[PDB]
Design a protein around this ligand. Structure first.
Ligand SMILES: OC[C@H]1O[C@@H]2O[C@H]3[C@H](O)[C@@H](O)[C@@H](O[C@H]4[C@H](O)[C@@H](O)[C@@H](O[C@H]5[C@H](O)[C@@H](O)[C@@H](O[C@H]6[C@H](O)[C@@H](O)[C@@H](O[C@H]7[C@H](O)[C@@H](O)[C@@H](O[C@H]8[C@H](O)[C@@H](O)[C@@H](O[C@H]1[C@H](O)[C@H]2O)O[C@@H]8CO)O[C@@H]7CO)O[C@@H]6CO)O[C@@H]5CO)O[C@@H]4CO)O[C@@H]3CO
Length: 585
């Protein structure tokens, strides 16, 4: 049993509260090293004479190299100390504690979770768990007011190939006019990219955080969108760029004019003025040389209050949350305080961050509710699209990601297939609608919150930016209504089956050879097994029947298949077919 591979910590994603009285504990070890893993615990002040409590940690999954065991400690005192009992294949057992590994339970020591504060229990908005987000790029969704259109706008047509600097006249009024379409599809929330005032084409360099860009609409119209959206049960999530401002931002406008005499000089990172935004820069900007985007000194108490006041203003308009662009570059303190402000104004307000790497340090409960699950996509692209990887490998990747953050976060990660920065998933599938659909089937049933990129529902395709930003197809006869209907039904199943939104995930079956994958979602007595045949050939397989839900199963897409035959289930799947097996509870 390789002791150097066993890992655990009384913090982070390995030991964290799910309530003021319940503590989840996680443990990692070499694949096939531990057969059974038990946990003995008791209050931190219990007498040495007292018998310890027992918790059996079932294997929650396994990846490319590690096994993951998960336990649930009951702590009525709100304090807890514990040790692990690990048993190997050959029957050898060993105790694992803070002190180390030993056959002696005392020499092993004991891990400690000092105390559990109700305020430190990771809590996220209930609606975000069963929501279905829809990403809207205002400029290209629906142009409901042609008098909004900027000079040089191009005609709105199907056979259109966008350019980096093209314009189509998309606005907020169109979003309103098209709400019925969205409600029908079943979207629960709408995500808008930056829509604040900006002289640029992308609006990432904000000019006035307190005003809507004339091109998309105005304050009154927004208010109306909010109401019409809310009235139809749809939340509005706005995109905010607080890491940097645009070259037009009033405060930068002042320093570029008043130099060191400006009372706003400490609001940016300026080396030596006289601020020279000519072509070289004497101030720190966004990526490298991007004068149009001066970084803001969020650490400065004066700046924080401004951004904080900005958040305050928009929350008065009824927005339901924020997506924080380039968040990993803002001090944690700011974020901890931002959370407080926001949750205090609206506890159901959602906070989503943009980090393209391990977002662990921002996912413990005091900063963000979740982030864009970039791992999810990278994994789906390679499995369903290109086929660079197989099901057994796939299973490992999905697991690897899941164990990264606390479950409260995992259930909230935004699972996208594409965005304005990638090509349409249809293109990745080489136009194969067969593959694409199976990917959506997965997306709508896996652990996390589905994020639909505007237009994917009607079968739109295109290469990466800007070919990924083609004007929405509003022609009934030019839309793939087959897919539209397909999306509607998957989304519908998601809202009625608790397992798909509030249940957990466990690997059910994965064949490297058949490239067939299956997983199971369980909440209380409900069980829904998903089978995926990622092959263009008809195949049949025998899956074990998890010891909990019954001998009868129903495919929510087609019809019954009660194959409970002595612990097995015989399933014949058509090429690229997927099944949603519900145990009926
Ligand atoms: O605020 C800007 C930007 O923010 C968001 O972008 C996020 C993005 O969604 C995430 O995917 C991630 O980005 C990482 C990226 O995915 C990685 O691949 C990698 O990037 C490498 C590139 O792949 C590589 O090609 C090269 O990039 C250089 C470009 O080739 C070069 O041309 C230039 O870029 C200029 C653009 O070409 C030009 O069009 C203009 O871009 C504007 C966008 O069009 C506009 O939509 C918006 O972009 C948002 C984006 O939509 C958000 O989602 O504003 C842009 C203006 O800044 O101007 C560009 C600048 O002149 O320069 C680049 C870089 O030098 O190398 C990179 C090397 O890393 O890493 C990326 C970051 O880690 O995260 C971002 C941030 O949250």
């Amino acid at each position: 049993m390789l002791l150097e591979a066993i890992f655990h910590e009384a913090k982070g994603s390995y030991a964290y509260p799910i309530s003021e009285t319940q503590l989840r504990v996680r443990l990692r070890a070499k694949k096939g090293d531990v057969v059974r893993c038990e946990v003995l615990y008791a209050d931190r002040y219990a007498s040495p004479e007292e018998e310890l409590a027992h918790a059996l940690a079932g294997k929650a999954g396994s990846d490319e190299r590690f096994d993951y065991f998960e336990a649930l400690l009951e702590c009525s005192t709100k304090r807890v100390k514990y040790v692990f009992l690990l048993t190997g294949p050959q029957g050898e057992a060993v105790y694992f504690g803070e002190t180390g590994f030993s056959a002696e339970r005392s020499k092993a020591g004991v891990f400690q979770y000092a105390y559990i504060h109700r305020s430190e229990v990771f809590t996220t908005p209930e609606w975000a768990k069963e929501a279905v987000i829809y990403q809207i790029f205002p400029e290209r969704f629906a142009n409901g007011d042609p008098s909004n259109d900027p000079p040089g706008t191009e005609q709105w047509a199907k056979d259109a190939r966008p350019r980096h600097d093209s314009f189509y006249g998309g606005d907020l009024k169109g979003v309103i006019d098209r709400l019925p379409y969205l409600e029908e599809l079943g979207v629960t929330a709408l995500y808008f990219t930056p829509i604040f005032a900006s002289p640029s084409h992308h609006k990432y360099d904000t000019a006035d955080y307190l005003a809507i860009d004339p091109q998309f609409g105005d304050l009154p119209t927004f208010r109306r969108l909010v109401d019409e959206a809310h009235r139809r049960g749809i939340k509005i999530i706005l995109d905010a760029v607080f890491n940097h401002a645009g070259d037009q931002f009033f405060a930068f406008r002042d320093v570029l004019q008043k130099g060191e005499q400006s009372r706003y000089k400490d609001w940016f990172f300026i080396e030596d003025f006289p601020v020279s935004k000519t072509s070289r820069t004497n101030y720190e900007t966004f990526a490298v040389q991007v004068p149009a985007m001066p970084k803001l000194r969020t650490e400065n108490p004066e700046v924080k209050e401004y951004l904080f006041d900005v958040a305050r203003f928009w929350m008065e308009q009824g927005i339901d949350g924020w997506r924080l662009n380039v968040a990993n570059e803002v001090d944690h303190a700011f974020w901890r305080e931002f959370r407080r402000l926001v949750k205090s104004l609206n506890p159901d307000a959602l906070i989503v961050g943009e980090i393209w790497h391990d977002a662990s340090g921002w996912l413990m409960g005091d900063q963000f509710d979740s982030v864009m699950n970039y791992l999810f996509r990278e994994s789906v692209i390679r499995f369903f699209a290109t086929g660079e990887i197989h099901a057994e490998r796939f299973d490992a990747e999905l697991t690897r990601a899941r164990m990264l953050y606390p479950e409260q976060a995992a259930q909230g990660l935004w699972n996208l297939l594409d965005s304005h920065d990638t090509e349409r998933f249809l293109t990745s599938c080489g136009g194969n609608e067969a593959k694409f659909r199976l990917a959506v089937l997965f997306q709508m049933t896996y652990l996390g919150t589905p994020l639909i990129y505007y237009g994917d529902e009607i079968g739109m395709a295109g290469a990466t930016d800007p070919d990924c930003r083609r004007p929405m197809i509003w022609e009934e006869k030019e839309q793939n209504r087959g897919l539209f209907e397909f999306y509607k039904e998957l989304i519908r199943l998601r809202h009625r089956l608790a397992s798909l939104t509030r249940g957990n995930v466990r690997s059910w079956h994965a064949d490297k050879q058949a490239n067939l994958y299956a997983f199971v979602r369980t909440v209380q007595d409900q069980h829904v097994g998903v089978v995926l045949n990622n092959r263009g050939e008809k195949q049949t397989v025998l899956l074990q029947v998890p010891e909990s839900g019954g001998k009868t199963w129903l495919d929510c897409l087609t019809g019954e298949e009660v194959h409970g035959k002595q612990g097995q289930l015989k399933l014949t799947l058509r090429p690229y077919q997927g099944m949603i097996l519900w145990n009926g509870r």
